[PDB]
Amino acid sequence: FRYMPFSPAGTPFGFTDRRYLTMNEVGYVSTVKNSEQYSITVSFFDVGRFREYHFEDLFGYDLCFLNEKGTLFGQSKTGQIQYRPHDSIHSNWTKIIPLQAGERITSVAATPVRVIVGTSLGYFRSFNQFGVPFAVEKTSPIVALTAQNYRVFSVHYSQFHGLSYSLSELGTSSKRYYKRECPLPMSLPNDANLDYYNFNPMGIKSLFFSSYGDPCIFGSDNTLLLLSKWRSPEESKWLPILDSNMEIWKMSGGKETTDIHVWPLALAYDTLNCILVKGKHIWPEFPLPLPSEMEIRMPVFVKSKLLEENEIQIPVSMAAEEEYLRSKVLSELLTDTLENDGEMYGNENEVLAALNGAYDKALLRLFASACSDQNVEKALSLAHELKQDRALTAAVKISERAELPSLVKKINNIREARYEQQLK
Amino acid sequence: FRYMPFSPAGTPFGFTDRRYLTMNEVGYVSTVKNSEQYSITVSFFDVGRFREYHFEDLFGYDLCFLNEKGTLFGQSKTGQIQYRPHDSIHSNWTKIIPLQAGERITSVAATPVRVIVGTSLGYFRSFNQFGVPFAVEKTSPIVALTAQNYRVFSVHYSQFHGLSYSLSELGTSSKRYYKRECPLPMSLPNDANLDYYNFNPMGIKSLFFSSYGDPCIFGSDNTLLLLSKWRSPEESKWLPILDSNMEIWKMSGGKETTDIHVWPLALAYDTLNCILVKGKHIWPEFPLPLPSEMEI
Amino acid sequence: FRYMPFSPAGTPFGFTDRRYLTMNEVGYVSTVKNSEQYSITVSFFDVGRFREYHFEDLFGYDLCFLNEKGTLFGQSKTGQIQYRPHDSIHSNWTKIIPLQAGERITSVAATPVRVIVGTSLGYFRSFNQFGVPFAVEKTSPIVALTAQNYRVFSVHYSQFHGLSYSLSELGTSSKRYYKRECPLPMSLPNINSDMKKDANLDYYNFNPMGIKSLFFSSYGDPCIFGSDNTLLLLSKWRSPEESKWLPILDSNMEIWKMSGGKETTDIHVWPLALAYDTLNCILVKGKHIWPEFPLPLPSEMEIRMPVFVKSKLLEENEIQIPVSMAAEEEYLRSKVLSELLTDTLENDGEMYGNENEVLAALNGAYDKALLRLFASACSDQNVEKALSLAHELKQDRALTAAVKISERAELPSLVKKINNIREARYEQQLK
Amino acid sequence: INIDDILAELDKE
Amino acid sequence: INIDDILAELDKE
């Protein structure tokens, strides 16, 4: 098996002399064949903060990672890396990674405080932002890396397990594993886009931490997978939180397309930052379109049922189910973040509060429909899933309006049962 | 490799127009091809407890799971499922499971409080007994599911290491994993019974929880495997507690008879509930013989 | 996959009639085909302590493990083992290990106080020095075992997981796990089709995993040495979530450096043991990568962090290393050894009696090497990089040295920032 | 069943 | 920059 150099949201050359090395919420990095050398351009989406620049690449960098403080470059064969801070205040530094016979650098990553290099033999080399090495580690062969602050999300490959992943923190003292080589349930690729899968065999279009710090991955099935409960080894689960194919289908008024594709940049709370690629190839081209936003949606919608109820219009009762699930997942994730790491941007507490509000509201709609169909048992089960005591009260009012006195008493018991815990 | 729709102790059509969807200690479910549709029958062994019933099947369910409170039906290709409570007090409900291109439902399972759907793409969808969704999880491709109360035992397939199993608990807090895609020590299939191994290529005749909460599997080698001490990672091992080939040999007075085959229904503390099948086929046909019990 | 009988630093017969059963810091054990029987010889490197002896093997022992008090022998097929104390105080004893159909003994190990036998079905059978059995345990199929005092380092292999390892202690009553079947990131051999006529193919038929040897270091940390000729050491094994495998010696790179930067094809390293910072080994000169007869004198190879690049080493010119470039490796090497030794002392205490002085000198070399990197950063007007380096200093007297270097470089802003580190540490010290 | 008035009441709390 | 004299002071401590 041939290990190919990986970078988040990178594109292949195809029939041209240019491609994107990497791509995310910060900006994009492209390279152009310049006779026997290369022209590298580093652009930004926030033109106010950073200034787009370019330079000549005499090494042939095929690896890249972009963050808000700098850009990391890598050469898969010679093992030469370079870190270039965005501000001219700090100096560039260059390093050559030692490589054994046949060993290639497969992925690099950088945060404002950490620089990471992974190889095909499973060598894991870390540095600080200045190039001071911390420790060399031997793991399973690495195929993909991403990082955020002090945390590292790595993808590994063996001929035994297939794809696995590790989740670690590079603290001041030592490297600690949250998760060590656990199964990575990403669908592998099973053609017009063959050039891409020669360039990216695993089909990992991109991978990243969300803004709130949860690992995400986006494969050839165009489904955003998010790792939930990663702080509890026995509770960790991968969640499909967006079928971009289904969202495109809904945008097109329920019509099948072959010329609209999604290229993942980042996940911010509930919104997937991406490029909407229109054309024959599934990867973005030149010039790069403006980034689009795609709200995440739990994959619980059926195409046949969506057509019957008719951009595709969703019936309130059907949308309430998805919103309930979507709120449930997001609420659980964000709460875990706040209960362990605290705030990062300054609006998490407000987001969580609004989130729980939307949760109960969507749940009450499902409750009402259950009451509408005289389904007391299903309604009572829904009421148990309510969060706010004020929502239980609202449920009582709905039960009264539905003229279901038996339901009212049972919900009032729930209220009293919760009030009971309040007296302890 | 082909992902065939699995159900516990299910039987193939063969050259007939009828077969068994699922089968356990509670009862048995059958389906019959008629002129334009299908006819599903749900029967019980304790006739004093539950009311046998039947209905027309316009969808053509090929997946089924039966517990002490209701029956779960599934259509593998259209993603249609239906839950029918044994009592009239509770309503039937129908729901359609989303399926991407080429994705099939591979196995379903239900408990009094949970409904589970697994797919060939490794989607794990859970509901309560009323159809309210609880979670959508992504795992390895699922080939077999079984459940007991809040516990789930799933068999997965990988391109790389083949069959594996997970063991989890869908508690009120969050889904906890006791075992996560661990090696499955079951023997794969090594003929008149050729329709069966086309119907069930993994040779898993059935799988279930014991009455004391232990995962059991019954492969083509006709040996009942029991996963003991799964609450402790250090001392969790599979125990071949019953080679049904031996027990038959003793009943034949020491005479190798290729007439009798064992069809597993359940494990009940001390005995193996089963169907003793006499004939060419290793699977039961119609009518269904009275349940037997083998000592462990 | 065929499980082959494994022994530390064992060699195949190859195209000869003799081979080494096992090999380490204590000595070596060889066997010679004697018509229809075998002649086993047990030799030692400390000829003063022990006396070389030999005996006739009517069983065909293909398994062996050597320690300072005795030698353990094993027959992979019949399941017969024998323990032979060096000293006459205790008697030899023989045992027959139960084996199912197709089950083979894959590895044996012995300390002065423990005897361990592993099988291809994953049976883990342990005894004391007199043959009194412990509980029998079932694990994953075992391919390699080593032991030190009461602790056992085991390698497992399945067609499911690949290579895993366990680290355990055999207490008075029962077996306790430090680590249980964690991933073992040792590179496997990449055998080609041109290897079918290769001179060294015989070894990988004899040892498919390519595990040339494995052992505890003298300070008690697990090590393994595979076909990639890289010494891997397991760090932080007392903390399950922190345990990491560290490559601490690329012997291919060291041979290259010894050869004055020249590529060779006739020099190979055969690992015996790791003593603190030095790899005890045999330097094999010839076509085959395993040693033969007669056995050369043991060599010493100091461990080096694999951070050196051949191209950069040539430019700066046995290969000479520039002090600034050597400082990076020395900082890293001291950092690892200091971290390892500290964990050892805080948990096990001293073993030989000079560890605290060793650790003290070690920390001295750490700060000293770090200050050289600090100076270079100061030299290149890089205040930020220098300050990051200063934070990594250990001794407060080293911080003082950093201040003086900062003053000589005329960087007053750096001086204040380093003095802040001193103040910040004093505050935490009072809590 | 309309609950828009009830939902609004829950938000004001 | 030579620091050999500074290093020597640290060793004597």
Side-chain angles (χ1 to χ4, degrees), chain B residues 209-220:
Chain B
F209 285 78
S210 79
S211 298
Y212 43 96
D214 278 30
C216 309
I217 200 168
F218 199 100
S220 55

Side-chain angles (χ1 to χ4, degrees), chain A residues 90 125 138 161 174 177 180, chain C residues 185 241 243-245 306 384:
Chain A
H90 313 292
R125 305 175 183 268
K138 185 77 165 59
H161 291 291
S174 185
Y177 282 100
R180 198 194 295 263
Chain C
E241 59 172 20
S243 58
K244 299 174 287 288
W245 284 95
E384 283 195 295

Side-chain angles (χ1 to χ4, degrees), chain B residues 237, chain C residues 122-127 133-138:
Chain B
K237 70 170 63 62
Chain C
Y123 279 100
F124 187 93
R125 305 177 183 270
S126 57
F127 312 84
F134 282 110
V136 182
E137 189 190 358
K138 183 77 165 58

Side-chain angles (χ1 to χ4, degrees), chain B residues 235-255:
Chain B
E235 39 185 345
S236 301
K237 70 170 63 62
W238 293 87
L239 307 171
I241 62 172
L242 189 51
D243 181 29
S244 61
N245 295 339
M246 280 293 304
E247 293 284 324
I248 290 183
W249 184 84
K250 300 193 307 176
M251 293 174 55
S252 298
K255 295 168 178 55

Side-chain angles (χ1 to χ4, degrees), chain A residues 305 317-318 320-321 324 362-386 392 395 398-399 404 406-407 410-411 414, chain B residues 81 83 85 89-96 112-113 115 127-134:
Chain A
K305 282 199 77 60
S317 64
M318 189 180 302
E321 189 176 85
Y324 151 71
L363 202 40
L364 286 174
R365 298 187 177 275
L366 297 173
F367 179 86
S369 299
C371 287
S372 170
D373 300 22
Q374 301 285 83
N375 199 335
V376 180
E377 282 195 295
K378 182 180 187 178
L380 179 60
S381 67
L382 288 169
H384 273 103
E385 296 304 311
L386 287 174
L392 281 176
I398 296 176
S399 307
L404 299 168
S406 52
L407 187 53
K410 290 173 179 177
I411 298 182
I414 302 176
Chain B
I81 68 172
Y83 187 69
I89 304 179
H90 324 268
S91 309
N92 301 330
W93 57 263
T94 301
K95 176 181 284 289
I96 308 184
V113 299
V115 168
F127 313 83
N128 64 0
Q129 71 265 37
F130 306 106
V132 185
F134 270 5

Side-chain angles (χ1 to χ4, degrees), chain A residues 157 160 162 185 187 223 233-240 299-302 321 324-325 328 377 381-382 385, chain B residues 90 95-96 98 100 123 125 128 130 132-134 136-139 159-161 174-177 180-181:
Chain A
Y157 177 87
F160 301 98
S187 296
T223 295
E234 58 172 19
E235 278 181 287
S236 59
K237 299 174 288 288
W238 285 95
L239 306 183
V300 297
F301 286 149
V302 189
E321 189 176 85
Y324 151 71
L325 253 185
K328 176 176 183 177
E377 282 195 295
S381 67
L382 288 169
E385 296 304 311
Chain B
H90 324 268
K95 176 181 284 289
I96 308 184
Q100 306 175 16
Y123 277 76
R125 306 170 181 272
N128 64 0
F130 306 106
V132 185
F134 270 5
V136 180
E137 187 177 343
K138 183 72 191 302
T139 64
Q159 316 170 357
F160 302 88
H161 50 68
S174 176
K175 180 175 183 173
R176 175 190 177 177
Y177 277 88
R180 191 191 297 269
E181 304 196 10

